[PDB]
Ligand binder design. Structure first.
Ligand SMILES: [Mg+2]
Ligand SMILES: [Mg+2]
Ligand SMILES: [Mg+2]
Ligand SMILES: [Mg+2]
Ligand SMILES: [Mg+2]
Ligand SMILES: [Mg+2]
Ligand SMILES: [Mg+2]
Lengths: 170, 258, 59, 167
RNA sequence: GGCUCAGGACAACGGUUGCACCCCCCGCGGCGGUCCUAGCCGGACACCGCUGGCAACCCGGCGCCAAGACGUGCGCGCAAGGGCGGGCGCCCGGGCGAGCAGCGUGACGCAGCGACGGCCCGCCCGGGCUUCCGGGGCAUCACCCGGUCGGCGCGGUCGCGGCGCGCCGAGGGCCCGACGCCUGGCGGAGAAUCAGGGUUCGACUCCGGAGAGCGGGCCUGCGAGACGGCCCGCAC
């Protein structure tokens, strides 16, 4: 019975989407062959998802969600490869993108002391994740998605609001 | 930004283990493409001129090679810049000399004279298993040799014994703990040891730990670990069994020889 | 169409050795195909305990 | 001439970057093919010598293509009648220009020649009884020289029907 | 290969990643099934003979002949592209850290090789872009950007990408110094000096980058925005 409820919920999302005439085009998952939704039995899978590997687990929201994102690392058509980094959220104002703040130390040999430095890194945030300012995120490297974006969010660790901004190298 | 591929090689930019003299000349030979690449090979002329001393100039080496007096795995080669590599066969029938190209403890190429019982084959390291046209399985080796329809039991990083006469596999050595290996690159080139641990890091290099027979222990990455048999070596090895002496011991040896 | 003696050398004449060369080439190609077929057959006979995926010859 | 180099763009902060070399042939571009539906006339396709000696062909005019009905597994070669919708601009539709993603009308003769009676998807049978069937383009003309696709069905068919019904 | 350092100040460059977004001549090793006159096919030009223009540079017309040149092509179905083919919380072979490859089947299309057989695949060197860190001075430069920031769709490219176009929303950077201006600014490996800590320089031998009077465009070719290759404007 649990699978049946999922299929009905997914099926509605496809048909209420066709009633949003404001949209210029019909957005779909490339892997799934439209036409399975005309089958009354639940003999076929209606949603596609994958495991990115490296020990990370797929969120239940992506598996049970009703959203389309070709740049998502779980339901889209991109692959994670290279460097995995961490940081805190700096701004979340774009449609599906954020700015990540990274902090590190730089050593000066003449004075035998350090300097605190930071860089800004832009990344893509899939709808499966909810993020506010100050949370800690883990980002994986992918192929160029835009002029400044080469990373994708993979894990979010909430932080309490009102907490003190602190220098947090990661 | 050069408009095309490079064809020259300055003497100072050449690999160190070739041991070219600084003032020999401005230029150095540029090996052509072949079984082995630039950084893991050595041109034929260097062996024929600066090692065996059979020739004193480029022209003599070219004449000798044209006369087809040198065989490399049973096939005469006329290219003065043909690249020679590890676990090759170097036989000169006209002087009844047969050698196998290996690495010395110091990390240089050496010629180990061999017998006829073991001079009709070579050992190859398998680096890749891929599907070719029509889904037919294949395999590739460190010497740029591709074999079709191999045994399923053969996996990556194994060692393969191919007969030179025909070019067919006869047996293979699995990659496992307790198998004698030889290091083919890095700071530990030429050493012989036995695998003791295999530690794999996700998304990065795999590290191999082996112990020398005397008791020494050293580490290297899997990309330059070469199995040369089970427990005991399948092929001949230089006089010293891959034991690198210390500076003090080497200085004592030098003084003794002086 | 139909001192020294100078005449042009004839071209496009098929003497004995051309026939032998063509026959040898044909035989070599035929035996190559036969050996490949035999190797495929023996490999297929092997793998009795595993799957396989090769392009089946049509016709 | 035409280039896709990033050296002529501004930086993420909005600053202007200096030009430190001349134009290179790695980063060149070419004019669009603008493939036109036929509706000295015939199919015309051109060949282009690309980098490495590779060959690329752009269609300038075509009239036919292969279309597949996935649900019943029926594929035939059909004639394209005209473009009726495009998600990028109405000007492409007016000019009858073929690109990937275009929604077109194909002749129903090949598909009504058989299985006009078999109980399949009802929404497609009604189209079969008529003269044209809504379809979509899946290939990239201008790169491969073909215009292939599939017959619509499911939610997308309803979406496009509602889109182009009130007109 | 050789010459030089004009240009260019989040760029070039140095170390460290990646292409599951890529191209690659020679060489080495494999592979080699091709739908519908083969004792061996067809026509030309070059050089050359005759005949000529023009100060030079340059070429014209007629005429028999060769190919490892050009064209056609004997041949056991095969190029590119396109539709369909896995799950029910996650994990526990061709191959991976990673659903990546290959294959079957329904439709299209007949690309390449073949008048002394090589299309194709792998390696190799090389290139293209790309991750992280470093990367001049002036605050009598304090606010700057408007394809500028992001999303959707198509096109083009060897290929990802505001690279370009249409629509949508608004964003992005900054005293941890943005933007602007200046430099008698190519960078590094390194050089001079000398308790230790440091200061100054770095046209020139090795590596990398850029250019061939200034600014643009392009053919050939695997590979050039080539200049001891061609076209245009300007100045000589
Ligand atoms: Mg035929
Ligand atoms: Mg021919
Ligand atoms: Mg200057
Ligand atoms: Mg230089
Ligand atoms: Mg140049
Ligand atoms: Mg030029
Ligand atoms: Mg030149």
């Amino acid at each position: 019975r649990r699978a049946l409820e999922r299929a009905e919920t997914l099926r509605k999302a496809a048909y209420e989407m066709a009633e949003n005439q404001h949209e210029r085009a019909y957005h779909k998952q490339s892997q799934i062959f439209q036409g399975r939704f005309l089958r009354k039995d639940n003999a076929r899978c209606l949603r596609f998802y994958k495991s990115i590997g490296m020990g990370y687990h797929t969120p239940i929201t992506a598996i049970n969600g009703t959203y389309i994102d070709k740049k998502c690392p779980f339901t889209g058509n991109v692959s994670i490869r290279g460097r995995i980094l961490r940081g805190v959220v700096h701004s979340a104002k774009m449609q599906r993108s954020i700015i990540v703040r990274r902090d590190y130390l730089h050593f000066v040999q003449k004075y035998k002391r350090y300097e605190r430095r930071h860089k800004h890194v832009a990344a893509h945030l899939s709808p499966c994740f909810r993020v506010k300012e100050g949370d800690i995120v883990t980002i994986g490297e992918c192929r160029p998605l835009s002029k400044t974006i080469r990373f994708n969010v993979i894990k979010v660790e909430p932080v309490s609001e009102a907490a003190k901004k602190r220098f947090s190298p990661f | 930004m050069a408009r095309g591929v490079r064809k020259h090689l300055k003497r100072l930019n050449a690999p160190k283990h070739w041991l070219l003299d600084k003032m020999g000349g401005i230029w150095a030979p540029r090996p052509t493409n072949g079984p082995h690449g630039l950084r893991e090979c050595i041109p034929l002329i260097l062996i024929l001129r600066n090692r065996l001393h059979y020739a004193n100039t480029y022209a003599e080496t070219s004449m000798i090679l044209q006369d087809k007096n040198v065989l490399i795995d049973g096939k005469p080669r006329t290219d003065p810049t043909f690249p020679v590599g590890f676990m090759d066969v170097f036989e000169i029938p006209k002087v009844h000399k047969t050698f196998r190209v290996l690495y010395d403890v110091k990390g240089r190429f050496t010629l180990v004279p061999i017998q006829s019982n073991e001079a009709g084959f070579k050992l190859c390291r398998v680096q890749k298993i891929f599907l070719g046209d029509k889904g037919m399985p294949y395999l590739s080796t460190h010497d740029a040799r591709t074999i079709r329809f191999p045994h399923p039991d053969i996996k990556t990083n194994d060692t393969i014994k191919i007969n030179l006469k025909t070019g067919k596999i006869d047996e293979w050595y699995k990659f496992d703990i307790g198998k004698i290996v030889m290091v083919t690159g890095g700071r530990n080139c030429g050493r012989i040891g036995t695998i003791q641990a295999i530690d794999k890091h996700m998304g990065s290099y795999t590290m191999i730990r082996m112990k020398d027979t005397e008791g020494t222990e050293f580490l290297t990455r899997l990309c330059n670990v070469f199995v040369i048999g089970n427990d005991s070596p399948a092929v001949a090895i230089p006089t010293t069994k891959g034991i690198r002496p210390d500076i003090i011991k080497n200085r004592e040896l030098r003084l003794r020889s002086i | 169409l139909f001192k020294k003696l100078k005449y042009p050398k004839v071209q496009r004449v098929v003497t004995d050795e051309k026939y032998a060369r063509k026959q040898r080439v044909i035989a070599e190609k035929k035996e190559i195909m036969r050996k490949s077929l035999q190797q495929l057959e023996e490999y297929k006979a092997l793998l009795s305990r595993m799957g396989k995926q090769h392009n089946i010859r049509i016709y | 001439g035409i280039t896709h180099d990033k050296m002529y763009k501004r930086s993420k902060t909005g600053a202007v970057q200096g030009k430190w070399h001349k134009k290179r042939k790695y980063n060149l571009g070419r004019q669009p093919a603008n493939t036109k539906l036929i509706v000295n006339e015939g199919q015309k396709i051109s060949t282009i010598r690309c980098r490495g000696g590779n060959i690329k062909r752009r269609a300038l005019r075509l009239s036919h293509g292969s279309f597949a009905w996935g649900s019943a597994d029926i594929s035939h070669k059909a004639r394209i009648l005209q473009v009726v919708y495009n998600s990028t601009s109405n000007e492409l539709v007016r000019t009858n220009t073929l690109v990937k993603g275009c929604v077109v009308q194909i002749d129903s003769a090949p598909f009504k020649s058989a299985l006009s009676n078999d109980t399949l998807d009802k929404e497609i049978l009604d189209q079969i009884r008529g003269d044209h069937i809504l379809a979509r383009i899946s290939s990239r003309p201008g790169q491969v020289g073909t215009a292939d696709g599939y017959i619509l069905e499911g939610p997308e068919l309803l979406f496009y029907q509602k889109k182009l019904a009130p007109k």
